[PDB]
Amino acid sequence: GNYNYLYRLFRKSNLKPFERDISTEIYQAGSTPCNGVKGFNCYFPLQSYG
Amino acid sequence: YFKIYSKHTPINLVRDLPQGFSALEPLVDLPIGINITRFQTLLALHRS
Ligand SMILES: *[C@@H]1O[C@H](CO)[C@@H](O)[C@H](O)[C@H]1NC(C)=O
């Protein structure tokens, strides 16, 4: 698997047309805020491709 | 997309905007294609 390609499965809003997003920011998947630290309901949105 | 309009208005006023009519002619296009929500101008300085 060539793991050099990534994608953003998790975010808050859907982008407007012709927009780019390369930022590496955490997202909250539940009632527990992340605040820059991983844990429950908190995942890194960029995942490599196998 | 992006558009620039400009016009060299000739004035002899003191403080406020002039009274009269004059339109601006487009000059430049520059498609950066990013999130633009603010802009800032430049002010030069001088030293005695
Ligand atoms: C532009 O940035 C603001 C905050 O910096 C964000 O709320 C907004 O969704 C962004 N818009 C686009 C089109 O990227």
From Swiss-Prot, chain B:
Glycans are attached at N35. Changing I11V: In strain: Omicron/BA.2.75. Binds to host ACE2. RBD also interacts with the N-linked glycan on 'Asn-90' of ACE2. Cleavage of S generates a polybasic C-terminal sequence on S1 that binds to host Neuropilin-1 (NRP1) and Neuropilin-2 (NRP2) receptors. Interacts with host integrin alpha-5/beta-1 (ITGA5:ITGB1) and with ACE2 in complex with integrin alpha-5/beta-1 (ITGA5:ITGB1). May interact via cytoplasmic c-terminus with M protein. May interact (via N-terminus) with host bilirubin and biliverdin, thereby preventing antibody binding to the SARS-CoV-2 spike NTD via an allosteric mechanism. Attaches the virion to the cell membrane by interacting with host receptor, initiating the infection. The major receptor is host ACE2. When S2/S2' has been cleaved, binding to the receptor triggers direct fusion at the cell membrane. When S2/S2' has not been cleaved, binding to the receptor results in internalization of the virus by endocytosis using host TFRC and GRM2 and leading to fusion of the virion membrane with the host endosomal membrane. Alternatively, may use NRP1/NRP2 and integrin as entry receptors. This is Spike protein S1. It comes from Severe acute respiratory syndrome coronavirus 2. The chain holds residues 200 to 247 of 1273 of the full protein.
